[model samples]
Target: YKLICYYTSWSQYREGDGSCFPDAIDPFLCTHVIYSFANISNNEIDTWEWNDVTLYDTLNTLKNRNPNLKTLLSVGGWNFGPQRFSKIASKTQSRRTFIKSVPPFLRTHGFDGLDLAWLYPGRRDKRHLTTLVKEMKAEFIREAQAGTEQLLLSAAVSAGKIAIDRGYDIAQISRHLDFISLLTYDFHGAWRQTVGHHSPLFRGQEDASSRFSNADYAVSYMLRLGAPANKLVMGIPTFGKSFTLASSKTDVGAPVSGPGIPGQFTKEKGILAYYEICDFLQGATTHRFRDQQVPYATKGNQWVAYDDQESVKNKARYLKNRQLAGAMVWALDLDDFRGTFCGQNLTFPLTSAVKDVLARA
Candidate 1:
């Protein structure tokens, strides 16, 4: 079993108390932590943030408390884009050059492995995606034979079937990668003129299109594609999607005017960190779907669809029922790490709920 934790390099810059540094993380809470992201520059792995290298040490240093802790460096993210990945994976020469530089960076920075988060590969880059992982895993094996512990190779992949079918040959990538983190959140957001939860564990009894939107569908679809159940890690978000209601109606599908107002700290419209959500929950009226087991909180005209502890626990038990590898938290920073928000008097409430339910296997 594993709880693969990922945190952003950009989080440190979040305003005021919303910012989370490496020191805020607790090593025992996760089996593995992936610091996102190291970028591709000049066809090689490079640090995206100016202080990523220092933070790598700062984050990885937690292992001193518990030797069992493993840290991996995640390369590429939504912001890193597909063009650079295209530059690296399109040809063998560039791919090898990129692959050859990974180990040195990992070992030098005291990282335990590598996580490829390509955001997504377009149809043209799909075959190259497979080849890229295949070659990287071979190199990992070759290096392992020499005396170092085998470096883990994993990936963060899309949730939707359209993206899944378009961007990946699941069977091929699964054969080479250690595990796949199916990004099950962000299914719906303020992008649409309607209200919807970002991450639902199961499908709601509404539109037929929703059959493909939930985490259960995402997992089942991957299993159908021949991805081993134990090699699939379902992703859960610590943040949420938000919106502003168009009228007085306040149902999931009610029309929305636009994104909800920004959080005081996050200050990002259409999104709210779990901690910020705690504040929203302070006065917001909360609602749940009878079929989906998802919750949304509304303050006046603002609507926020996010997971609470109960919902996260449901997903963890769901993980157990499926015998999946573990839960993958999109981030550690997004949770209420300070333990002050939500009146729960606990830190990392969403993640802690998961660890409790994902019993040792």
Candidate 2:
């Protein structure tokens, strides 16, 4: 309930010095550590990587730090897509096939939970997903009663009302899920040619569905839709949504042509790891929207809007102020985990910030 950090399983292939192995992780960084993805094959909970068994052995060693860490496996990322999930959630028998295998699979692997992350609830997935959730929760309860630490069943949910409205039976899942990782980021990215901050804390001057996107609005909407605040884990990002400005205007609604220049290490189009962002911000002009309470950096045609420690602290305050479960970061790899990048000489700075803020509260 304090901090949840997602560990992308693919970080091991970061192309060079950036590959994050389980040993590089500071166990104290997160209360709950979740492996990025597993799989759904023939209606069974499965491992996505062949090397995962050995890797997971190294991962659970993280608990040796005795940080009270709980490890989980998250399935169904954006890459896995929603259609596969739609099939798994369709029929009652199909649901049981997945649910039946979960408890034993996790306990055998030294995992404490299973996090359902169906990129999002698709049109057909809304009600079906709820039924799926309800069944799993019931199964989890049934097993726990026979003596286990009540294996956690959580979900990495979305932030978009547009998606949430069509993507999840919010009220139903809320009641069944142990914790809701409200992925309160990705409000905007390089996908649109125009600029919008990655995860704004408040509404900005821009128009058009402006009210629905930021963290606060998303939280309010979920609360309105019957999600209990205590069960909500407001998500924070250690990355930035960057873009290439196409014109002279660098304001909120300015035009853009392409994704931001990729990072040297975690080279993803349109995004930068917080560490990579440290280099990106070099000589870049920084913009802070008092209205939105987030920062944006622009150098010539390249632009980035991301959570610095300031914005990250603000987000923690928001979650504490709202009396929610805790703060969860989308990833640990995206942060400055090695203490080498970002010039702050700190490891997992943003994730650590969330822990500090929540611990104090």
Candidate 3:
């Protein structure tokens, strides 16, 4: 399994924002960089200087540094209101219009391909989002089959069937593109009316008394539905989601207060974002889930759901066992850059641990 890196302009990194792209060139670690989106049709490109040179140069630099680095242009994000997709997907002309625009757009910026990150399939008023993906895949294959250029095609799909059925025509969709990414995180949060495992494997045999959420089921079922095993990339979160508790005994869905229902929490953000929780990892106590190979943390009454080395290994093993493609982690910035989060002594601990298992397996 190769590495894939994801970046968004609205994120902390952008032009002249004095933002650093430490993640821009991870030579041995990652093979792809997905620029969040252009937001072209909506005229939102002006928000961040729309520096075409910055993106292409960034891609060229990464390519020069690592010959295997393939840069992709990602369209749509969590906050971009995917409902706009419905507007464009409503008619055949609109669909063709967007498709026609991408090649020139790619040529304009020197990108390898496009990665669609539209959130939900049916709910976006895009009941035909799946058809859209199929059509786009057909267009991509058509371009590649014509022998002009071999452009890569893929999409970041939602974890469940709801998103799958609504958006992707699995059989035809899988046949056209290279692979699909499953955003397996955010399965549970304070936004939930009941507290549950954010990304549990089997809902747990230990918690038989309490009804467990079907986190793993969401992913496994997707494969059964038609997603090709090797063409499926499991998504992991680099950060955590913080939940405000009405009481110590409150359920996941119990009413609570917090800044974001689902956002990147960090060490700097204290108890706020998932990244903040990494800061306490040294002193943080952990509980292991042998079956899933994932972990959880609780410190001073705060609860955090995250993946650890063991859990990462388990997922890798799961992928290997299931004959699926490798895993794709979230943002690279959130990891303990200096190795402090996983343990101060471990060198290149995060990626190394995952790679070690993948290699051994």
Candidate 4:
């Protein structure tokens, strides 16, 4: 099983106590660490800064501690948009240029592979994505045959069925890539009119929404579509969706006026990091739903949708039962990295718990 974790580049600059540097990473916690968000400029891989190259070196240096750990550069994200990928993948020449430019760039800077974090492709660009992956696979094979290091190729894919059907030819795409990272979180958030679990293991009995709005459905649907279970890693969020209620009622489907107040450190309304959630739950009323296999907390008008250690353990068991690859933390930085604010003395408690369960599984 592969336990992957995303390491966001900008987390180094987070204010006050929540900031995390590459040096803070626990190399043994995950098998692979993906550095998020390099971009494409003038048809070549580009970072917003030259210092990022140096940062890449620092990130790979973690291998000194854990030789088994692999570092990957993730290109494109929700912020990069899809136009560049669509344009580059549409033509053979541009595709070749992009693919050809990848190996040396990664090799020069010390990276094991590339992870495509394109938020998604529109329906028109779906087939072009196939072309891109096929070319990348061919290039990787050539490098292997030439006695160079073999680079792993993987992509972060949407878990929503509509996005999956419209944005991917899964069977075809899955064959070329080493693994598919299923973004199984974000099933429900502030965008919803009512409260719901952001990544429930099963559809709750109280849920009136579509059955597809849960992680279990997403995994089952993808597997039934012929995507290999071993090549798919489920995403688990180390954060929670926060909401502000309109009235005194604060149940599962409680009405909300808007997002809940942002955390002092994370400073992002509607989303609370695990550390922030830990702080929020302090002396607050917390509830667990056995049927849904998740937990949540609320205080006054504020409600949060999040997963705890128990929820993660259950999800890991689910992955084992279904023979899935393993779990992927949406990010490592958001966890209680400092070990001070989270009540538990352990650092990366969520990830540590997840690692233990995945190991046992």
Best by TM-score: 1
Candidate 2 residue 124 Cα shift, in angstroms, is: 2.0
Candidate 3 TM-score to native: 0.82
lDDT tens digits by residue: candidate 2, 1-361: 4788898888888976688887788887788989989988889999887888877788898887865888999988878967788888897788799889899988888998899988877777788888888899898899988877898989988899889888788888899888999888888776776888869888876565668889998999999999998899999999888788899889868998878888898877888888888878889999898788889999988888888999999999999999899988987988888878777678888888888888895
TM-scores vs. true structure, each candidate: 0.98, 0.96, 0.82, 0.97
Evaluated at residue 159, the lDDT of candidate 2 is: 90
The candidate that wins on lDDT is: 1
Q: Residue by residue across 1-361, what tens digits does model 1's lDDT show?
A: 7999998889999878888889889989999999988888777888988888789889988999979999999988888778889878997999999998888789889988999999888899889999999999998999888698999999999999889899899999998999999999968877677888879988876765768999999999999999999899999899988888899989757999999899898888988899989988878898987588878888888888999888988888898889998889987998999999879689888999999888654
- Residue 359, candidate 2: Cα error in Å is 1.6
Q: What CA RMSD would you report for each candidate?
A: 1.1, 1.4, 4.2, 1.3
Number of clashes recorded per candidate? 0, 0, 20, 0
Candidate 4 residue runs with Cα over 4 Å from true position: none
Angstrom error at residue 169, model 3: 2.8
Deviation from truth (RMSD, Å), model 1:
1.1
User: What is the full ranking by TM-score, best candidate first?
Assistant: 1, 4, 2, 3
Off by over 4 Å in 3: 13-19, 22-24, 42-52, 123-127, 142-148, 206-215, 249-275, 289-292, 338-342, 345-348
Candidate 2 TM-score, true structure as reference: 0.96
Query: What lDDT score goes with residue 36 in model 3?
Result: 68
Please identify which of the two predictions, 3 or 4, would achieve the higher lDDT against the true structure. Answer: 4
User: How would you encode candidate 4's per-residue C-alpha lDDT over 145-171 as one tens digit per residue?
Assistant: 768779999999999989999989899
